[PDB]
Structure formats: structure tokens, C-alpha cells
Amino acid sequence: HMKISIIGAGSVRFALQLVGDIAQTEELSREDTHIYMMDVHERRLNASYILARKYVEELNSPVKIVKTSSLDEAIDGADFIINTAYPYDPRYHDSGSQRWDEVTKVGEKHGYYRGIDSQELNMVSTYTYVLSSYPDMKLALEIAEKMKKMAPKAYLMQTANPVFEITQAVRRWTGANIVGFCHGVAGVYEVFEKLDLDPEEVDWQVAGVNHGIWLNRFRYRGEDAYPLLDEWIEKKLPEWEPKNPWDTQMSPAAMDMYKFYGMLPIGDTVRNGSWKYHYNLETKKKWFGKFGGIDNEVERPKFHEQLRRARERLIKLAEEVQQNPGMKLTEEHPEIFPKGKLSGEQHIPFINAIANNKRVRLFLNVENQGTLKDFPDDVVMELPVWVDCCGIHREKVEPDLTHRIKIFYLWPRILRMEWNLEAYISRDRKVLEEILIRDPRTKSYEQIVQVLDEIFNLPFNEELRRYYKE
Amino acid sequence: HMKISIIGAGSVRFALQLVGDIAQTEELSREDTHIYMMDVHERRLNASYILARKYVEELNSPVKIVKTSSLDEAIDGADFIINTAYPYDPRYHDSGSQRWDEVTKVGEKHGYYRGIDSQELNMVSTYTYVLSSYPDMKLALEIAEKMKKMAPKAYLMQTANPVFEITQAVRRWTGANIVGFCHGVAGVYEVFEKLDLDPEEVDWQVAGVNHGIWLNRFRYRGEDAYPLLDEWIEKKLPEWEPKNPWDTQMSPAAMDMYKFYGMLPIGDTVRNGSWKYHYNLETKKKWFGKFGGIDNEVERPKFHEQLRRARERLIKLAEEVQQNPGMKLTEEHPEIFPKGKLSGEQHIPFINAIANNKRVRLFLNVENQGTLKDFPDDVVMELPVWVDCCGIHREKVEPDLTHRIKIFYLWPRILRMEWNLEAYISRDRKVLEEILIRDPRTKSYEQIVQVLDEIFNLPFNEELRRYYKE
Numbered sequence: 001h002m003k004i005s006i007i008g009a010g011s012v013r014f015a016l017q018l019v020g021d022i023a024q025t026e027e028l029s030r031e032d033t034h035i036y037m038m039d040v041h042e043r044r045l046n047a048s049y050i051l052a053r054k055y056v057e058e059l060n061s062p063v064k065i066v067k068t069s070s071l072d073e074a075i076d077g078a079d080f081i082i083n084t085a086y087p088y089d090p091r092y093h094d095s096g097s098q099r100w101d102e103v104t105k106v107g108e109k110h111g112y113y114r115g116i117d118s119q120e121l122n123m124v125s126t127y128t129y130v131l132s133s134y135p136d137m138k139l140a141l142e143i144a145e146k147m148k149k150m151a152p153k154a155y156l157m158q159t160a161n162p163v164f165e166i167t168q169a170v171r172r173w174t175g176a177n178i179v180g181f182c183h184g185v186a187g188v189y190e191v192f193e194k195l196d197l198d199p200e201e202v203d204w205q206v207a208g209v210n211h212g213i214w215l216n217r218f219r220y221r222g223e224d225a226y227p228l229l230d231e232w233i234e235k236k237l238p239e240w241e242p243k244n245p246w247d248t249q250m251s252p253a254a255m256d257m258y259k260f261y262g263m264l265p266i267g268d269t270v271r272n273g274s275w276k277y278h279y280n281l282e283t284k285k286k287w288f289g290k291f292g293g294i295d296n297e298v299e300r301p302k303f304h305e306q307l308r309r310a311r312e313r314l315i316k317l318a319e320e321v322q323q324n325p326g327m328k329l330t331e332e333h334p335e336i337f338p339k340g341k342l343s344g345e346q347h348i349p350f351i352n353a354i355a356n357n358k359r360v361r362l363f364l365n366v367e368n369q370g371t372l373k374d375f376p377d378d379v380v381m382e383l384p385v386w387v388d389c390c391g392i393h394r395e396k397v398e399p400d401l402t403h404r405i406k407i408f409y410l411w412p413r414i415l416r417m418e419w420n421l422e423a424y425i426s427r428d429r430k431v432l433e434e435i436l437i438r439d440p441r442t443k444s445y446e447q448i449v450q451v452l453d454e455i456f457n458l459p460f461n462e463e464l465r466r467y468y469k470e
Numbered sequence: 471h472m473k474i475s476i477i478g479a480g481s482v483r484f485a486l487q488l489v490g491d492i493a494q495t496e497e498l499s500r501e502d503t504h505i506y507m508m509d510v511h512e513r514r515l516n517a518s519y520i521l522a523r524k525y526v527e528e529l530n531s532p533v534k535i536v537k538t539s540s541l542d543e544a545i546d547g548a549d550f551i552i553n554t555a556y557p558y559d560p561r562y563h564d565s566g567s568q569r570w571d572e573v574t575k576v577g578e579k580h581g582y583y584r585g586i587d588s589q590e591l592n593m594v595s596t597y598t599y600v601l602s603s604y605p606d607m608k609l610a611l612e613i614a615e616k617m618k619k620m621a622p623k624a625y626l627m628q629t630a631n632p633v634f635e636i637t638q639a640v641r642r643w644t645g646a647n648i649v650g651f652c653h654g655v656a657g658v659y660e661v662f663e664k665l666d667l668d669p670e671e672v673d674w675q676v677a678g679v680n681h682g683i684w685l686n687r688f689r690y691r692g693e694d695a696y697p698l699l700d701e702w703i704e705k706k707l708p709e710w711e712p713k714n715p716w717d718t719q720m721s722p723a724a725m726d727m728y729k730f731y732g733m734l735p736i737g738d739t740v741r742n743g744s745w746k747y748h749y750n751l752e753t754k755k756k757w758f759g760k761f762g763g764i765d766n767e768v769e770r771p772k773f774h775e776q777l778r779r780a781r782e783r784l785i786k787l788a789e790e791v792q793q794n795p796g797m798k799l800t801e802e803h804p805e806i807f808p809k810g811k812l813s814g815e816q817h818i819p820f821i822n823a824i825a826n827n828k829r830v831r832l833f834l835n836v837e838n839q840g841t842l843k844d845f846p847d848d849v850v851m852e853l854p855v856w857v858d859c860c861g862i863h864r865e866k867v868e869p870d871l872t873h874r875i876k877i878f879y880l881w882p883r884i885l886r887m888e889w890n891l892e893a894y895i896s897r898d899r900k901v902l903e904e905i906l907i908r909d910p911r912t913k914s915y916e917q918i919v920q921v922l923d924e925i926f927n928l929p930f931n932e933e934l935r936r937y938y939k940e
């Protein structure tokens with residue numbers, strides 16, 4: 001049997017994406033493939049399970065789908081464990097995004113625009129939680145330790161955030177076989193589209209850290225293609241407009257970073273700029289166009305409300321499936337239940353590469369081990385790799401990242417990772433304080449104490465408060 | 471002949487200290503030792519020369535003292551070149567400290583308390599100048615390149631600030647035989663005095679970067695002595711009072727850093743804390759006692775005025791020597807012209823070790839070359855070394871610096887060095903801007919542009935403005 005366990009399968013849309021991809025991958029769509037859907041939130045989990053089962057029936061896939069509320073049962077003997085859990089306490093919240101929103105509001109109350117978790121080169125919303133990401137870190141480490149005992153040959157595929165911090169901590173502190181996953185590299189394809197380049201004719205590479213990746217190689221017809229970006233900047237950037245709040249790859253911010261660093265930041269890296277692009281909403285609109293991007297006080301709550309409505313509709317759709325077994329999810333909701341189209345995401349290609357030797361190029365968070373020679377061997381980087389049944393094989397990164405990327409961007413972000421890990425493992429509030437002492441928004445030490453006090457005293461943070469109790 | 475050249479010998483008191491030490495070192499107080507005193511400021515230089523010559527006469531030393539206004543003449547065939555020059559333009563200023571004071575005032579005008587050169591872990595006054603330290607860097611590099619051609623066997627002994635940045639840049643960019651000098655390590659002896667320990671019974675070591683050194687080993691009677699510091703903190707810190715504005719080694723700030731980092735910061739490292747200790751004068755007085763330390767808007771101008779008065783008195787004393795050849799400088803001014811007492815500083819012990827094999831332990835700024843294994847080989851560190859005629863021999867640093875010192879202190883300060891070097895060599899104002907974009911005192915990008923504009927437009931910064939002209 002091939003056991004693929006989705007931890008946090010109450011994240012309905014992602015669970016359905018994974019199931020859909022497995023059921024449309026020939027080498028994996030087999031009777032001996034068992035997909036375990038695990039979560040502690042029964043209403044969400046039941047909905048995901050109902051829709052997943054009806055979905056594979058319509059795809060005429062023979063995969064087995066099992067629902068469980070037991071973490072141990074999901075881990076036991078698993079071949080791949082996909083951690084997409086974003087924990088939350090249903091006594092207070094209906095989503096992990098809600099606990100992030102509420103602590104962010106407390107930060108803003110104390111003078112930290114977009115919350116204390118928003119930091120230079122670290123603006124992506126919902127990425128860390130009170131700096132050290134205690135609930136998310138704790139759960140990943142618990143999974144890793146169970147997996148070492150109950151599934152020693154499994155891969156832990158970490159998708160819940162912070163991918164950088166969690167993958168680092170699990171690797172360093174447990175030695176468990178964890179790999180971090182993020183689709184941010186997909187930004188390159190919009191660069192190629194806006195420059196009118198056939199992507200198949202582009203020789204390209206990216207590298208960096210999660211949400212901190214750079215287009216280090218960009219070549220076309222045997223020449224550097226960056227002069228083509230220079231021409232686009234001069235002729236077309238003035239007319240650029242975001243299609244939606246997430247659209248930033250060709251934004252003024254991205255091009256300002258390219259001018260300074262010498263390479264274009266890719267994907268969510270564009271969100272992770274210095275404070276120059278993020279002082280306030282008006283500044284974000286200058287640098288990202290009319291929406292101000294997605295990491296602001298208007299668009300981020302709006303988006304989280306869209307998610308809530310979307311998941312409630314999926315839960316209702318599951319009730320409809322139970323009442324009308326004759327309906328076709330693939331006909332009435334093709335966007336959610338596609339047939340004959342893979343998602344394009346990396347998770348199931350990874351599984352098919354490891355398990356069935358379908359070799360593929362992916363961008364994964366793995367230990368550097370000398371790929372970027374100026375950084376420590378054990379620091380987790382987002383790197384171009386080839387994956388097959390013999391494991392993960394790092395590409396040579398050529399051209400090297402620029403001097404400015406290293407000293408002004410990667411090293412500061414790597415140090416922040418180390419600060420955050422130290423804040424977690426030390427259980428020492430003084431480390432959280434020191435992080436905010438390096439925060440440009442801090443005006444006084446008393447401000448730091450008070451904002452942390454109020455965050456810790458939120459009712460849903462009792463375990464966190466006790467964790468850090470001096 | 472043994473040629474020791476003091477570049478910036480118009481720094482009268484330091485020049486006299488060097489001369490006094492040479493003339494009281496048996497292996498160096500010889501007819502074949504020639505001390506060249508060089509500077510471009512004739513009134514200062516003439517005074518230093520007059521007093522130096524009268525001084526060695528009273529010490530009955532046979533050393534030869536030569537005065538020159540020619541840099542090439544001073545460098546030509548030198549064995550040791552001591553760069554203590556702090557350049558300034560006499561059309562505007564009477565000291566290098568004055569150009570620093572005036573740019574600092576402009577910074578404060580634009581909302582940067584204690585000037586843009588004051589940064590986290592980098593509060594020491596007059597250490598950098600408009601971040602990249604253009605005039606000071608430029609002069610050191612000019613000396614290094616002349617020395618490679620005209621004195622290929624010489625040591626360049628860098629004492630002018632920034633010692634870290636300049637020593638790094640000269641080593642990396644010219645490969646010249648430069649070594650950086652600073653006496654900050656002397657703070658350890660006040661620790662031993664306040665804990666009632668015979669210094670000769672203490673087994674100790676420090677290491678770090680310039681003004682960023684830590685008491686990594688502190689042992690007494692075969693045990694860790696840090697518990698003795700813990701007892702002093704509990705019983706005696708509440709009654710601690712600074713003797714003068716420079717007195718900070720046992721201050722609340724120093725002990726707060728010890729509590730966080732696990733080792734005591736030594737010397738000027740105590741001045742180089744986070745912004746926690748430096749938001750404003752009242753905060754500095756909380757953490758450093760009644761003066762607020764030396765790096766504030768009251769004590770630093772007061773001290774620079776004391777320096778001006780002191781140097782004017784020395785210039786007048788030189789006129790008095792010329793009029794009254796019969797007076798004894800050693801009798802009427804023993805503090806300035808000591809006899810039978812070495813200064814305790816490292817410069818002349820270094821020379822006697824290299825030249826005459828009088829081996830000695832010193833703390834010098836030299837390339838890491840694996841001494842602190844987590845940092846690059848070529849980064850200049852302030853390290854414990856033994857010096858003899860075979861050169862500089864790094865001690866093993868044991869215990870290693872703590873994890874927190876590395877990730878929260880040394881790496882950020884090293885990155886700042888790299889930022890500053892990049893700002894210099896790139897000639898790119900955008901790098902200076904990026905440095906201020908990482909500055910907690912920055913409220914907006916427009917503020918950065920305006921403060922840099924006004925600094926560049928000061929009349930005495932014309933060469934600097936043209937250097938950075940886009």
C-alpha cells in the first residue's frame with residue numbers, strides 16, 4: 001500500500017486539489033493508493049471527505065480515501081505526510097487566519113502597522129504568529145517526532161507557514177525527513193508572459209529562501225534576457241496595473257528591488273520588501289498599484305472573509321452531495337473539481353518522483369549543503385532540485401546570487417529565522433522583546449512590553465502565555 | 471635604520487604617547503630608530519614636533535625625530551606606519567571631530583537622534599562619517615597603495631576610525647599589510663577591580679569585532695568566575711555610579727546585555743548596544759547613570775570642547791618651550807610627559823614584538839581565518855593574538871561566543887560593515903538610502919532623501935557629493 005496522509009484535511013480546497021491531482025496521476029491512481037484525510041475539526045473534515053469521495057468516483061479513480069480524527073492513525077506507516085494544518089481553537093475562532101488577524105489588530109493598536117509579525121523582508125500575511133509561531137511550530141515538531149517512530153521512511157511535506165522557520169527547526173532539532181513546499185516560483189511565468197517570451201525558450205533559474213527567491217538566471221536565445229526586462233521597465237511599467245490584490249510580480253516595487261539587487265525578486269518575495277514599500281496604505285498603493293497589494297488593512301480582511309464564505313459554501317455543497325447522489329460535481333463546479341487538468345502545484349509531482357521515479361524539477365526548501373557557498377550548510381534554502389527515487393538532487397546555482405542580495409536581503413532574513421527559532425526554543429520572552437527592539441516601528445521599550453502583554457493575555461493564547469511564563 | 475612613521479602626528483597627545491613609549495622601550499630607544507611625524511596641518515604638526523623633541527631630550531633617548539608635510543616621504547621605506555589621521559578641511563573646521571559634530575546636527579534636525587551614523591550596535595561617536603566614512607576610507611586606501619609600492623615590508627597600523635570598516639576594506643581591496651588597533655579590551659581590568667580579583671590570578675579571554683568584543687572566558691581559582699559577577703549584580707549594581715561620562719563597564723546597560731547574551735560586553739561594546747539603551751537622553755541616563763554616557767547631545771559636545779582647549783594649550787606649550795629651553799616638560803606637566811612609565815597601549819609593544827621578537831599578547835583587528843568558525847575567513851575580527859618576529863598568531867577562542875551573540879550581535883554588526891563598504895565602493899547613494907531604510911528612526915523614504923541631501927550639500931562635503939553624483 002501507498003499511504004498519503006493529509007494533516008489538516010479540513011482545509012477543504014487544498015485537500016481537494018491534492019486528491020484531484022493524485023486521482024489524475026496514472027502511477028498513483030491505483031487501488032493500492034490510500035489517501036488519509038485527518039483533522040480535528042469534524043465539520044470541515046467531514047465535508048472534505050464527502051466531496052473528495054464523490055470527486056474520485058466521478059474521475060473513475062480507484063484510490064481509497066480514509067477519514068480519521070486521529071493524528072497517530074494518519075501517521076502510522078505513512079509514505080508521505082502533507083502538513084497543511086493551520087491550527088485554531090473553535091471556542092474562539094473558525095480559522096487559523098482569524099487568530100492571526102486578531103493578534104495583528106492588537107499590534108496595530110500598539111503602533112505596529114500590520115502587526116508585529118509584519119517585519120522588513122517578512123510582510124507576507126499569516127506567515128509567522130507572534131514571531132515564534134508557537135502553535136504551528138509545536139504541531140510540526142510533534143508530527144516529526146511521531147513520524148520518526150511510526151513512519152521512519154516517510155517524507156514530511158511541510159506546507160503550513162512559516163515554511164522556512166518550521167522546516168529549519170524540524171530538520172535541525174529532530175533530524176526528521178522534512179521538506180518545505182511553496183509555489184512562489186510560479187511568478188516567473190508572468191514575467192515571461194509580460195515580456196512576450198515562450199517559457200519553453202527561456203533558460204531560467206531561481207534561488208534564495210522561502211518567499212525570498214531571486215531570478216538569478218534569465219536567458220533567451222543564447223543571451224542574457226534581463227535587457228528585455230530593462231526595456232519593459234522603460235516602455236511599459238508606467239502603464240502597469242494590478243489585475244487583483246495579489247498581482248505584484250511586475251509592480252513598481254518589484255522593479256525597484258531589481259534595480260537595487262541586480263536580479264528580479266520572484267513571487268511572494270515582492271511582498272517581502274523593506275519598509276520603503278510598506279510604511280502605510282498610501283505607500284503600498286504607490287508601489288503596488290491601486291489595491292496596495294494583499295498585505296494591508298483593507299485587502300487582507302477582505303480576502304479572509306472571502307475564504308470564510310468559500311469554505312462555508314463547500315461545507316454546504318457536501319450536504320447537497322449527501323442529499324443528491326446523482327449530481328456531478330465536475331459538471332456543476334468545474335473550477336473546484338477539474339477533470340483532465342493537473343493543478344500545476346508541486347506536491348503530487350514530488351510524491352510521484354520519490355515513489356515512482358517520475359523525475360521532475362521542483363523548487364523545494366532543503367538544507368543548503370554548500371549550494372550557496374557563503375551560507376551555512378544546514379540553513380534551509382528554497383532551491384532548484386531534481387527529484388527521483390534516489391531523492392533530492394540540488395542544481396548548481398549559476399549565476400550566483402549578487403553581493404547585495406546576500407548582504408542586504410538573504411543574511412538579514414536568515415538571521416530573522418534564527419531569532420524566531422531562538423525565541424521558540426528558549427521559551428524566553430526577552431528574545432521576543434529583542435526582535436521588537438530591532439523593529440523600526442518601536443518607539444520605546446515600554447511599548448514592546450505592553451504589546452506583548454496584551455497579545456499573551458488574549459484568551460486563546462493561554463498555552464502560549466504559560467509557555468513563556470518567566 | 472628603523473623607521474616608524476606617525477601619519478596624523480598633529481594629533482598631539484597621541485603622538486606624544488607614541489614617542490614617549492618608543493623612547494622608554496630599551497630595544498627601540500636607539501640612534502638607528504627614526505620617528506617620522508607627518509601631517510598636513512602645520513601649526514599642530516610643528517607643536518607636536520617641538521614637544522616630542524624636547525620630550526626625548528629629557529628622557530635622554532637617542533631616537534631621531536623628523537617632521538614632514540609629505541605623505542610620500544613618511545611612507546618611503548617605513549617599517550611601521552601608524553595611521554592616526556582624522557582629516558579635516560581648515561577652511562571650515564579645526565578638527566575631524568567638528569565635521570562629525572556638524573553632520574550629526576543635520577541628522578538630528580531631520581529626526582535622527584545622535585545623527586545617522588549612530589545605529590544599533592554602533593553608537594560610538596565619531597566612528598563612521600555619513601555611513602561610508604568617505605574621507606577616512608579614502609585616505610587609508612591611498613596610504614595602503616603607496617605603502618605597497620614604497621614600503622612593501624611595512625605594517626600599516628590603523629588607529630583612525632572606523633577601525634573595523636577601514637581594516638576590512640584595505641585588507642580585502644588592496645591586500646596591504648594592515649592591522650587595526652583599539653584599546654577597548656582594557657575594560658576587563660575594571661571588571662576585575664570591582665569584583666576584588668587580582669588580575670594576575672584571572673584566566674580570561676575576549677573576542678568579537680572592534681567595539682564588539684565579549685568576555686568569552688572568565689575564570690578564577692580553577693572555576694568559572696561569572697557567578698562572582700552574578701553576585702556583584704545582585705548586591706552592588708544598585709549602588710553603582712559612573713565616575714565620569716566614559717564610565718560604563720559595570721553599568722546597568724552592560725549587565726542587561728550580559729543577562730541576554732550570556733557573556734559580558736567589554737569596553738566600548740557597552741556603548742554599542744541596541745536602541746533599548748539609547749532612545750533619548752533620559753533613557754541613556756537610566757541605563758548608564760547620571761551622565762547618560764558619552765554618546766549624547768550634552769556630554770559629547772562637552773568632551774569635544776575639552777579636546778579643543780587641550781590641544782590649544784599644547785600648541786601654546788610648544789611656543790613656551792621655544793622661548794624657555796631650560797624648562798622641564800617632565801617636571802611641569804608629568805601627566806602629559808611621563809618618565810619611567812609606559813602608556814599600557816598596544817602600539818609600541820606591537821612594534822617591539824615584530825621588530826625585536828619581544829613576544830606579547832595583544833588584541834588586534836585581523837582576518838578571522840577560521841578562529842570563529844561560523845564567520846567568513848576574510849572578515850576582520852578583534853582577536854586575542856600573540857605577536858613575535860614571525861608575525862601574528864591567533865589564540866584559539868575558547869569557550870566559543872554564544873549563539874545569541876552570533877545571531878543577535880556579531881552577524882548584524884558584520885552585515886553593517888558590509889553595507890558600509892558597499893556604500894563606499896559602489897559610489898551609489900541608493901546604498902546609503904538602503905542603510906537608512908533599515909534604520910528604526912526612519913519614518914519615510916522622503917525623510918531619508920532630505921537628510922542625505924542636506925548632509926551632501928554642506929560646503930565641506932563637496933568632494934563627497936561629487937563622489938556620489940548619480
Ligand SMILES: [Co+2]
Binds near residue numbers: 181182183184211
Ligand atoms: Co508560500
Ligand SMILES: [Co+2]
Binds near residue numbers: 652738
Ligand atoms: Co576604539
